[PDB]
Amino acid sequence: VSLSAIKMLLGFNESMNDISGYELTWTGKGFANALYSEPCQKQLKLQESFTPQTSHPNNAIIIGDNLDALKLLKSAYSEKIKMIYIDPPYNTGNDEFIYPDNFRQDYQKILREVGESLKFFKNTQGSGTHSGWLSFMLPRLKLARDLLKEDGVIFISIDDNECANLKILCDEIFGEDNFVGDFIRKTKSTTNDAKIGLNYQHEFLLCYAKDKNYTNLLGNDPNGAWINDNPSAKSGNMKTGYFGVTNKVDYPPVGMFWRFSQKTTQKTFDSLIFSDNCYMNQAATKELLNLGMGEYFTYPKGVEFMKKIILHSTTPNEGDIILDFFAGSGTTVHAVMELNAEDKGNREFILVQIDEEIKEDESAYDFCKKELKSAKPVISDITIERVKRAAQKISQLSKDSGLDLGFKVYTLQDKSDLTPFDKALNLALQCGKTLNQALEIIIKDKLYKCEDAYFCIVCDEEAQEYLAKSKNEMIFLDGYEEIDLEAFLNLNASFKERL
Amino acid sequence: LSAIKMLLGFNESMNDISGYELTWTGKGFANALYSEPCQKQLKLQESFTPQTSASKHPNNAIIIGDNLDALKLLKSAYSEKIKMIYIDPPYNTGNDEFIYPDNFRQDYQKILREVGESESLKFFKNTQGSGTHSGWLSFMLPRLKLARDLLKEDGVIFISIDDNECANLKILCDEIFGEDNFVGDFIRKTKSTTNDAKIGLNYQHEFLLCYAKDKNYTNLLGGEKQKTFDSLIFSDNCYMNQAATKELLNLGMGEYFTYPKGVEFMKKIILHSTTPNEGDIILDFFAGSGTTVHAVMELNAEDKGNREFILVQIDEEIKEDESAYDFCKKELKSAKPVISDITIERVKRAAQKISQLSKDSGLDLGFKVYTLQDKVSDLTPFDKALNLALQCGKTLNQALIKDKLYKCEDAFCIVCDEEAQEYLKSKNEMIFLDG
Numbered sequence: 001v002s003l004s005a006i007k008m009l010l011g012f013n014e015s016m017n018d019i020s021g022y023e024l025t026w027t028g029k030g031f032a033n034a035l036y037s038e039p040c041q042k043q044l045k046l047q048e049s050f051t052p053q054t055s056h057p058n059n060a061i062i063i064g065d066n067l068d069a070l071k072l073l074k075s076a077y078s079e080k081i082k083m084i085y086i087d088p089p090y091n092t093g094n095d096e097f098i099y100p101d102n103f104r105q106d107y108q109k110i111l112r113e114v115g116e117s118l119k120f121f122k123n124t125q126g127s128g129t130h131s132g133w134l135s136f137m138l139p140r141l142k143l144a145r146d147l148l149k150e151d152g153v154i155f156i157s158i159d160d161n162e163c164a165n166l167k168i169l170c171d172e173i174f175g176e177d178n179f180v181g182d183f184i185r186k187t188k189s190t191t192n193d194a195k196i197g198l199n200y201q202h203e204f205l206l207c208y209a210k211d212k213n214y215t216n217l218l219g220n221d222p223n224g225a226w227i228n229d230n231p232s233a234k235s236g237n238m239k240t241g242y243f244g245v246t247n248k249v250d251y252p253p254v255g256m257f258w259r260f261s262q263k264t265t266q267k268t269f270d271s272l273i274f275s276d277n278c279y280m281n282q283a284a285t286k287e288l289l290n291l292g293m294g295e296y297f298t299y300p301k302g303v304e305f306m307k308k309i310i311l312h313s314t315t316p317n318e319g320d321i322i323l324d325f326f327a328g329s330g331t332t333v334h335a336v337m338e339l340n341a342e343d344k345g346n347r348e349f350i351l352v353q354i355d356e357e358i359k360e361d362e363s364a365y366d367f368c369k370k371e372l373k374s375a376k377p378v379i380s381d382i383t384i385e386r387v388k389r390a391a392q393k394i395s396q397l398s399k400d401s402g403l404d405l406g407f408k409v410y411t412l413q414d415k416s417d418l419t420p421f422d423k424a425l426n427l428a429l430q431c432g433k434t435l436n437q438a439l440e441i442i443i444k445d446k447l448y449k450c451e452d453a454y455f456c457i458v459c460d461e462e463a464q465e466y467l468a469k470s471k472n473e474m475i476f477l478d479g480y481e482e483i484d485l486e487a488f489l490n491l492n493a494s495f496k497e498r499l
Numbered sequence: 500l501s502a503i504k505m506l507l508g509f510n511e512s513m514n515d516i517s518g519y520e521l522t523w524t525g526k527g528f529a530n531a532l533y534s535e536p537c538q539k540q541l542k543l544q545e546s547f548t549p550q551t552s553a554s555k556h557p558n559n560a561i562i563i564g565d566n567l568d569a570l571k572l573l574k575s576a577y578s579e580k581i582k583m584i585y586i587d588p589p590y591n592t593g594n595d596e597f598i599y600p601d602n603f604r605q606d607y608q609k610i611l612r613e614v615g616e617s618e619s620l621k622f623f624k625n626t627q628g629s630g631t632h633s634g635w636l637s638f639m640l641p642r643l644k645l646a647r648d649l650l651k652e653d654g655v656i657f658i659s660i661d662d663n664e665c666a667n668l669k670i671l672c673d674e675i676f677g678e679d680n681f682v683g684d685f686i687r688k689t690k691s692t693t694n695d696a697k698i699g700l701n702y703q704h705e706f707l708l709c710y711a712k713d714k715n716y717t718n719l720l721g722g723e724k725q726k727t728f729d730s731l732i733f734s735d736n737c738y739m740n741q742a743a744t745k746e747l748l749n750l751g752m753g754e755y756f757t758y759p760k761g762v763e764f765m766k767k768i769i770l771h772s773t774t775p776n777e778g779d780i781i782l783d784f785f786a787g788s789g790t791t792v793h794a795v796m797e798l799n800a801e802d803k804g805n806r807e808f809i810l811v812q813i814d815e816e817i818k819e820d821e822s823a824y825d826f827c828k829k830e831l832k833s834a835k836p837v838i839s840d841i842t843i844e845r846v847k848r849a850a851q852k853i854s855q856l857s858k859d860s861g862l863d864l865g866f867k868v869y870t871l872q873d874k875v876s877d878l879t880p881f882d883k884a885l886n887l888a889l890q891c892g893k894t895l896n897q898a899l900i901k902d903k904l905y906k907c908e909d910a911f912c913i914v915c916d917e918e919a920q921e922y923l924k925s926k927n928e929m930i931f932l933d934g
C-alpha cells in the first residue's frame with residue numbers, strides 16, 4: 001500500500017546489485033540458503049539387510065528426502081566421499097517441477113519472519129519456474145560439497161532447461177576454479193519433435209571438483225607398487241582371446257577375454273566420449289526391460305555410461321565411496337557392482353531415494369502391492385528391487401565371494417519407535433563411525449562396539465560396568481537415554497563421553 | 500557494519516520480488532549504451548570485384564569499425580531485415596583474457612549524467628577489470644540487443660562460445676530474446692588430443708547457441724523450407740580446429756590469424772538458416788578472418804544462390820611483433836596495420852579463387868568497404884548522400900547528378916540549387932533533403 005514511484009526502491013536495489021557484483025539471483029534464494037544451516041531432525045532406522053546369500057554389507061540405501069540424508073551423513077562423512085553422481089529432475093516443460101521444500105516443517109519454521117504477502121511469492125517462485133528448481137538444488141549441492149574429499153568430484157546430469165543455471169549455481173557453491181568440465185551424451189538418433197527442423201539430440205554431464213588441485217580423472221625384480229592388474233577385460237577379442245594359459249589351465253572369466261593372444265597405459269576422460277550411439281537412451285531402456293522392471297521406470301540412465309564415470313573418478317582398491325542421492329532406478333549402484341566385479345574392486349555405495357507415493361494408475365503400483373509385499377507403493381520400493389535383481393544377477397555370474405553385493409536399507413524418522421540397535425547405530429554415526437564400519441558388534445542389547453570404541457545405550461551397570469573394566473578403548477553413552485548414577489561415577493576416569 | 504545488516508537484507512527482500520535475474524556490475528550502463536543515439540556515419544573506402552562481371556554495385560558490404568556503432572547505424576535501414584546472424588565473439592579465456600573496452604566512449608557521457616573521475620567510479624571499474632564476467636557481459640549486452648532489432652520475424656542468431664562464458668551467454672540471450680525463443684545448442688568437436696591433460700581430462704568441444712527472433716516463424720531444414728539440423732552434427736572430426744587452419748594456410752594467411760573458424764562449419768550453418776534464392780542477408784559483426792563470408796560465397800556458387808553479407812571488423816592496431824604487421828604494411832601497403840586489413844585480404848583471396856573456379860558471369864563475389872567516421876567534414880558528397888539514403892530506409896544493397904543530386908530507386912541531393920530545381924522530369928518522386 002504505497003506509491004508507484006517506488007522506482008526509488010527499485011533503483012536503489014538495482015544499483016546495489018551492481019555494487020554487490022556478479023551473481024545469479026532468484027526468488028527465494030535467501031531461504032534456500034537458510035534451510036542449509038538448519039539442524040538435522042532425523043535419525044536412521046534399520047529396515048532390511050540384503051545379501052544375495054554370499055556372506056555385514058559395506059553398502060547402504062537410505063529412504064527419505066535427500067536434504068535430510070545428507071544432513072545426517074555430514075556427522076560421519078564430511079570430506080569422506082570420493083564421488084557424487086546425481087541425475088536430478090530436469091525442469092522440462094513435460095515433467096515440470098514443483099518446489100517441494102514449501103511443505104517442510106523446518107522451512108515453515110524458517111519462515112517465522114511472516115506467515116499474507118506470502119501468497120505473492122508462492123506464485124512468483126511457482127512451478128516450472130527456475131526460482132523453484134534453483135532453491136531446491138542449492139542447499140543439497142552445498143551439503144554434497146561438504147561430503148567430498150579434497151580429491152573428490154561431483155557429476156550432475158542436466159538438459160537445456162537448467163544446464164546454464166546449474167553451471168552458475170555450482171560455480172557459486174564449488175568455486176568457478178573447481179569446474180572440471182562438461183561431458184556431452186548423445187540421447188537419441190532421430191527426434192520426433194522436429195517442429196522447426198531441429199533434431200535436438202543431446203544432454204550434459206557437469207563435473208566439479210572439491211579442490212581441482214587434487215583431481216585426477218585418468219582411467220625391476222623386487223616387489224613394488226605395480227601389483228599387476230586383471231589380465232581380462234570386457235572386450236571383443238572373442239576368438240583371439242578365449243584360450244589357455246606346476247600345471248593348471250587358466251581360462252578367462254566369462255563375459256571377458258584375455259588381454260593377450262596366442263604413460264602409454266593411462267586413459268584420459270574425453271569430453272565427447274558419450275557422443276557415441278552406445279550411450280543413447282535406448283541402451284538404458286533395454287537394460288531395465290531385461291531386469292523386468294521396464295514397466296516401472298521410464299527414464300533411467302544407462303549402465304555402461306555410469307560405469308565409465310565411476311571408472312574415471314574412483315580407484316579400484318581403496319574403498320572409494322560413491323554417493324547418489326537422486327537414485328531413481330538405482331542405475332549407479334548397478335554400475336558400481338558390475339564394475340567392481342570386473343576388476344575385482346571394493347567400491348562402496350550410498351544410495352538415497354525419496355519415498356513418494358506411486359499413483360494407482362501406474363503399472364508399478366500393483367507390482368509394489370503384489371510382487372513387492374508393499375502396503376503403500378513408494379518409488380524406493382522399485383529402487384531397492386532393481387538393485388536386488390542386479391546384485392542377484394551379478395552374483396550368479398560372478399564367482400568371487402570376496403565381492404560384496406549386499407546392502408542395508410535405512411529410513412529417516414523424526415527425532416521411541418527405535419530399536420536399541422537403531423539408537424546405538426545413530427550414536428556411532430554421531431561419533432565418526434560410518435555405515436560400512438562393521439555393523440557394530442552386539443554385546444547384550446545394551447552395549448555395542450564399533451571399530452575399537454563401545455557404544456552404550458542401557459548403561460545399567462550390568463557386566464556393562466564389569467566389561468568396562470576393560471581399559472584402553474573409548475566409551476560413548478547416549479545422553480538422551482536413562483542412565484544410572486552409580487555406574488557413571490564408578491566408570492571413573494577420562495576416556496568417556498556422554499552425548 | 501551494523502547498518503549494512505538491513506541494507507544487504509532489503510536487497511535480498513527486493514530481489515525476491517524482482518525475481519530471477521543474472522546480475523553483474525555495470526549492467527545498467529550496458530543497457531543505457533544501447534539507447535544512446537548513433538554517433539557515426541559511413542564513408543566509402545573501396546570497391547572490389549573479382550572477375551570482369553562489372554556488376555557496378557555489389558550487394559555485399561564490409562564495415563570497418565566498432566560493431567556497436569555499426570549496428571546502431573544499420574538499425575535504421577536494416578531493422579527486421581536480416582535473415583541470419585553469426586558471431587564468434589572473444590571467449591574471454593584464461594590466456595586471451597578480455598578487457599572491457601566500452602568505458603572509453605560515450606559511456607563517459609552516460610557517467611556524466613551520473614557521478615563523474617570520482618571515488619565511486621574507481622570502485623565499479625576495479626570490480627570489473629580484466630577477465631571478469633561483468634566486463635564481458637556488459638560488452639555483450641548492447642550489441643546483442645541491437646542484433647535482435649535487425650533480425651526479421653523469421654530470423655535466427657548463432658553465437659559460438661566455449662565453457663568460460665557459455666552459461667553466462669545463454670542466460671543473457673534468454674533475457675534479450677526470451678527463453679522461449681531459444682532454439683537449441685550445437686556441439687562442435689574442437690580437437691582429438693588436448694594440449695595438456697593436467698587432471699586426466701581431455702576437453703575437446705565448444706558450443707553454438709541458436710536463438711530466434713520469433714520461434715514461431717523459424718525453420719532450420721535444409722532446402723527451400725527434407726533434412727533436419729542435428730544438434731550433434733558438428734561433433735565429427737570434420738569440423739575440428741585443424742580443418743580451419745588448413746584453409747588459411749591454403750590462402751597464404753596461415754601466419755596472420757590465430758583461431759579461425761572453418762569453412763565447412765559455417766557453410767552448414769548458412770545452409771540450414773537461409774533460403775538460396777530470396778535475397779537473405781547474413782550479418783557477422785565479429786568478422787575476424789571472415790570465414791563467414793568465405794562460406795556464403797562458396798555456398799552461393801554451388802546452388803547459385805543470391806545470399807548477401809555484411810561484415811563488421813574493428814580496426815585494432817596490429818603490433819610489430821606479430822607477423823601480419825610486415826604483411827599489411829608491404830603486401831597490403833597499409834600505413835597502419837589493422838586486423839581489418841587481413842580480414843579484407845582473406846575475403847579478397849577467397850573471392851578470387853572461387854571466381855577462378857566458377858563459370859558464372861552473374862555470381863556476385865565483390866563488395867564495398869565502408870569506414871566509420873565520427874565527424875557526424877571528411878565526407879565526399881556521395882558519402883553525405885549515402886548516409887542520407889541510409890537513414891530513409893534504403894539498404895546498402897541499393898545503388899544511389901554530378902556531385903549534386905542522387906537517385907536510389909525512385910528518390911536525394913546535397914546541394915539543392917538551380918540544376919536540381921529544373922530537374923523536378925519525374926514528378927511524384929518524394930525526394931529527400933539533408934540538413
Ligand SMILES: Nc1ncnc2c1ncn2[C@@H]1O[C@H](C[C@@H](N)CC[C@H](N)C(=O)O)[C@@H](O)[C@H]1O
Nearest residue numbers: 065066087088300301326327328329331353354
Ligand atoms: N528430495 C529427494 N530426495 C531423494 N530423491 C529424490 C528427491 N526428489 C526426487 N528424487 C528422486 O531422484 C530421482 C530423479 C531421477 N531422474 C534419477 C534417475 C536415475 N539416475 C535413473 O537412472 O533412473 C527420482 O527417482 C526422484 O523421485
Ligand SMILES: Nc1ncnc2c1ncn2[C@@H]1O[C@H](C[C@@H](N)CC[C@H](N)C(=O)O)[C@@H](O)[C@H]1O
Nearest residue numbers: 565566587589759760785786787788790812813
Ligand atoms: N567491438 C568489436 N567490433 C568489431 N569486431 C570486434 C570487436 N571486438 C573484437 N572484435 C573482433 O571479432 C573477432 C572475434 C573472432 N574470434 C572471430 C573469428 C572469426 N569468426 C574467424 O573465423 O576467424 C576478432 O577479430 C575481434 O578483433
